[PDB]
Design a protein around this ligand. Structure first.
Ligand SMILES: O=C(NS(=O)(=O)c1ccc(NCCSc2ccccc2)c([N+](=O)[O-])c1)c1ccc(-c2ccc(F)cc2)cc1
Length: 181
């Protein structure tokens, strides 16, 4: 069978996380140490598309929304006290109007943003904790909706273009016929 969503959540936040960490030079394998097998050329499949959309989303979403969670992040001060309580409290606030594809892109970049920042200073020990909270939220606190709408394949085929348009141009005045009369 396909048995999707079998384990594309725990390593979903870590995959995008490293994508933003390597940009700063923090890496991830060195975050909490842990033995390092190797992974030279295992291949396996590496044919995931969600990581692609979530990638551009972190950029596109960070343009039209000059102010998205400017208050949410400010309400997540990192410290030896809160963690999943305040994180879920402000996070649930995002998944309240209605679980949507964009909402899933905002909660994703929002989490990686908390790790890239906590690690940007000198705290690479609470990265698995934050990434874990987002991993569980997607494990069974959102998946049921990801498929009810269509599934990750839709989250990309719907917005994440994949050379499927086969139109190239598309402009032509305004890709429309001014139906508004
Ligand atoms: O528009 C939203 N969701 S959506 O209507 O379902 C949508 C719309 C367009 C795109 N993409 C095309 C335009 S770019 C974009 C991408 C992600 C988020 C926003 C824009 C995507 N998406 O890619 O996931 C998703 C959306 C808008 C605002 C918020 C939001 C909620 C609370 C906040 F504090 C800040 C922002 C959360 C989601």
């Amino acid at each position: 069978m396909s048995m999707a969503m079998s384990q594309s959540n725990r390593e979903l936040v870590v995959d995008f996380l490293s994508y933003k960490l390597s940009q700063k030079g923090y890496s991830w394998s060195q975050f909490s140490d842990v033995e390092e097998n190797r992974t030279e050329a295992p291949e396996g499949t590496e044919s995931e598309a969600v990581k692609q959309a979530l990638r551009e989303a972190g950029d596109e979403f960070e343009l039209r929304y000059r102010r998205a969670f400017s208050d949410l992040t400010s309400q997540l001060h990192i410290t030896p006290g809160t963690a999943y309580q305040s994180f879920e409290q402000v996070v649930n606030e995002l998944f309240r109007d209605g679980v949507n594809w964009g909402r899933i892109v905002a909660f994703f970049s929002f989490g990686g943003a908390l790790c890239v920042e906590s690690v940007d200073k000198e705290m690479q020990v609470l990265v698995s904790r934050i990434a874990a909270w987002m991993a569980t939220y997607l494990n069974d606190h959102l998946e049921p909706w990801i498929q009810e709408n269509g599934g990750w394949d839709t989250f990309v085929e719907l917005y994440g273009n994949n050379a499927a348009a086969e139109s190239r141009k598309g402009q032509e005045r305004l890709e429309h016929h001014h139906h508004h009369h």
